[PDB]
Amino acid sequence: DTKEFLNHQVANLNVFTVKIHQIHWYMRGHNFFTLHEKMDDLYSEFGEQMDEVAERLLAIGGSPFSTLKEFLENASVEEAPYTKPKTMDQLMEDLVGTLELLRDEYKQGIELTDKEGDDVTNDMLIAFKASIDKHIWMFKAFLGKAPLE
């Protein structure tokens, strides 16, 4: 149902923000500064997304996860500890991959909310998916690829 999905996306968004901090810290290359501030922007944006999703889950009477243990236990986003220097394009491909994951899962949540008659969470997930899609186009354009490639 909607509550399990919203909590699932809470965990996914927390792990996502931690990953955004990983790229924010370990990046090296010519595009260091631009993608550094860009990573800060992403941290703020997806943090606000996580806050709105969790408070929405509270609004519908649910209970969001509030510990790292619950996050790691329920998140479907994969995290990898940093062990050796990586290129900028690799970090951007991991970011784009997570963005595609959240795109698909958010779409499934849009269909689920549309069936269950929760138009609020439906519209919310629609807006979040819009921002995620725009970011997919931008970051896939950084890698010199089509948005559907």
Annotated binding site for Fe cation: 24, 51, 55
> Is position 66 an interface residue for a copy of itself (rule: CB under 8 A)?
yes
Instruction: Give, as ranges, the residues between 68 and 97 that touch a copy of itself (CB under 8 A).
Output: 68-72, 79-82, 85, 88
Q: What are phi and psi of 59, to 5 degrees?
A: -65, -30
Instruction: Give, as ranges, the residues between 108 and 147 that touch a copy of itself (CB under 8 A).
Output: 110, 114, 119-120, 122-124, 126-127, 129-130, 133-134, 136-138, 141-147
Measured distance CA(44)–CA(5) in Å, rounded:
22
Q: What is the 3-state secondary structure (H, E, C) of 32-73?
A: HHHHHHHHHHHHHHHHHHHHHHHHHHHHCCCCCCCCHHHHHH
Binder of residue 6, out of a copy of itself, Zn ion, none (CB less than 5 to 8 A by kind) = none
Binder of residue 74, out of a copy of itself, Zn ion, none (CB less than 5 to 8 A by kind) = Zn ion
CB nearer a copy of itself, residue 58 or residue 97: 58
Instruction: Give, as ranges, the residues between 35 and 94 that touch Zn ion (CB under 5 A).
Output: 37, 41, 43, 51, 55, 74, 76, 89
Measured distance CA(106)–CA(104) in Å, rounded:
5
Judged by phi (left if over 0) then psi (alpha if -120 to 50, else beta), residue 85 lies in beta
Widest distance between CA atoms in the chain: 48
Measured distance CA(71)–CA(67) in Å, rounded:
6
Binding stretches for a copy of itself (CB under 8 A)? 14-15, 18-19, 21-22, 25-36, 38, 51, 54-56, 58-61, 63-72, 79-82, 85, 88, 110, 114, 119-120, 122-124, 126-127, 129-130, 133-134, 136-138, 141-148
